[PDB]
Amino acid sequence: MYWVRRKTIGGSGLPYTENEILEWRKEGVKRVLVLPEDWEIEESWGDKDYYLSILKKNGLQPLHIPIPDGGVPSDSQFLTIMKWLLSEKEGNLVHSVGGIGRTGTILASYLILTEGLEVESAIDEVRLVRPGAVQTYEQEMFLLRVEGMRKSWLKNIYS
Ligand SMILES: O=[N+]([O-])c1ccc(OP(=O)(O)O)cc1
């Protein structure tokens, strides 16, 4: 697991055993934005809702927002993501399956709006702790679309 900003927002792939989830809890995680797709989760645990139940079990408030592999959040989802992340600062963990593409994208989209950084730079930061962060033209297109509305993106959020 990795921290982008120490204890405010970090990420990882999809855990396989409970311990790994207590690894999060121990490294400082408090909340969790689950990014995998239903089937992606269950192929690992056997039951999506069961996984979300243990997430809540260890406290961690789980917000499940599905994002297909190599894809990007939908305008609504994203705003729904920020409202979530930008409303608890401490302990955020964004995870998908590999914790490289979809997670890298979301973290970067966070930095872009929080630290007002351009894409290639936000990416550069995330790849600093998460090597190879962001893997599809789709995601790059998004981040760009984001950076081009860091204005409304925030007005939308902090409304
Ligand atoms: O190995 N995999 O099956 C796999 C690896 C990475 C994936 O996507 P990510 O979590 O956005 O990096 C999705 C699936």
DSSP structure class, residue 3: E
**How many Cβ atoms sit within 10 Å of the Cβ of residue 82?**
21
Q: Is the CB of 44 under 6 A from ligand 1?
A: no
Query: In whole angstroms, what separates CA 40 from the centre of its chain?
Result: 16
Q: Any residues with CB less than 8 A from the CB of 14 and at least 6 apart, and which?
A: 36, 40, 41, 44, 95, 96, 97, 98, 99
Note the CATH number of domain 1-159. Answer: 3.90.190.10
Four-point Cα dihedral 152, 7, 5, 73, nearest 10: -40
First to last CA, the chain: 33
Q: Is the CB of 96 under 6 A from ligand 1?
A: yes
Residue with tokens 């592999």: 69
- Report domain extents, the chain: 1-159
Looking at the DSSP bridge assignments, the partners of residue 62 are 32
Experimental method of this PDB entry: X-ray
Q: Which atom of ligand 1 is nearest to the CA of 67?
A: 11
Nearest CA owner, ligand 1 atom 4:
98
Helices marked H in 28-149: 38-45, 48-57, 75-85, 102-114, 119-129, 137-147
